Design a binder for this molecule. Structure first.
Ligand code: ATP
Ligand code: MG
Lengths: 201, 86
DNA sequence: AAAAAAAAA
């Protein structure tokens, strides 16, 4: 209730938290069941705050940032057990978030290499690890919400949408909904949001 | 301290964000640098409108005297369309 | 096995 505006963003969040049913076929393999939402906008437009709210209100979710994560350790890791002395897999960031939702900040600022992990997971909702003699397919049917800022400091309305976003088209095509948010200067809305924020504090 | 006033007046500066609403104000009525009549308050100043002003007779309206102004604010420009002065 | 710093292409 403390976020002014963003009505349809809230509606999309509500539809995402309780998304559609998964369809499986004996011949059609697998059909994706949830919805992913991506947001891009100029700074200070309440994206991280809404993401934190979604994290707090969700039944199961994991917090992740683009710069402070590595794709190899984000899915599965190989470590040795102290008792037995053998090596066994450790679940990654989104494996723990199976059937949950994963929220990522600074999505555009993440290293390009790690992005392939998302390219692996969001494709078929299954991550396959093959390293040091371990062969297993791990299930991960999580939904991913991300927020990234454009290449320039502020969004350019007069420019091509493709050149405003640093991410490649391959991953952008997977996300169902693209939302662009800008803080247009308007004295009426400035007064309204100012009195609202002063009410909050 | 007046008995009648217990309606409330509003500072000039708080007129910036709203429009199409009537208000009561008071301040130094004088001429700005450009040459128009304006109201000055410890908060700010605005432009006035006189073309449809009905005064309270029996008063010498001279620049430099505090006057109670009633009218509607408009944000198309910065014109406070006055309807009465007392 | 996996993270982080350095010189050279
Ligand atoms: N509509 C709004 N209602 C209330 N607060 C808002 C609104 N829009 C922005 N804010 C405020 O903007 C501030 C900036 O917060 P935050 O950094 O999370 O936003 P952001 O848009 O996600 O920024 P960034 O792109 O830098 O991560 C917050 O303190 C938040 O309260
Ligand atoms: Mg933020």
């Amino acid at each position: 209730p403390s976020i002014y505006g963003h009505d349809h963003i809230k509606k999309a969040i509500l539809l995402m938290l309780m998304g559609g049913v998964e369809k499986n076929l004996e011949n059609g393999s697998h059909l994706r069941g949830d919805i992913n939402i991506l947001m891009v906008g100029d700074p200070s437009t309440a994206k991280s705050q809404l993401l934190r709210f979604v994290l707090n209100t969700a039944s199961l979710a994991i917090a992740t940032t683009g710069r402070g994560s590595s794709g190899v350790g984000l899915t599965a890791a190989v470590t040795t057990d102290r008792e037995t002395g053998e090596r066994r897999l450790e679940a990654g960031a989104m494996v723990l978030a199976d059937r949950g939702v994963v929220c990522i900040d600074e999505f555009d600022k993440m290293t390009d290499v790690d992005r392939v992990a998302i390219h692996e997971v969001m494709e078929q909702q299954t991550v396959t690890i093959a390293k040091a003699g371990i062969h297993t397919t791990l299930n991960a049917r999580c939904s991913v919400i991300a927020a990234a800022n454009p290449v320039f400091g502020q969004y350019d309305v007069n420019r091509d949408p493709h050149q405003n976003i640093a991410l490649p088209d391959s991953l952008l095509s997977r996300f169902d909904l693209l939302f662009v948010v800008t803080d247009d200067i308007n004295e009426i809305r400035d007064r309204s949001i100012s009195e609202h924020v002063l009410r909050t504090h | 301290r007046n008995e009648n006033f217990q309606m409330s007046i509003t500072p000039i500066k708080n007129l910036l964000g709203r429009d199409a609403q009537n208000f009561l104000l008071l301040g130094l009525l004088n001429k700005n640098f450009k040459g128009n009549w304006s109201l000055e308050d410890p908060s700010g100043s605005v432009e006035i409108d006189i073309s449809q002003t009905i005064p309270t007779q029996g008063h010498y309206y001279v620049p430099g005297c505090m006057v109670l102004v009633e009218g509607i604010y408009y944000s198309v420009g910065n014109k406070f369309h006055v309807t009465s002065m007392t």
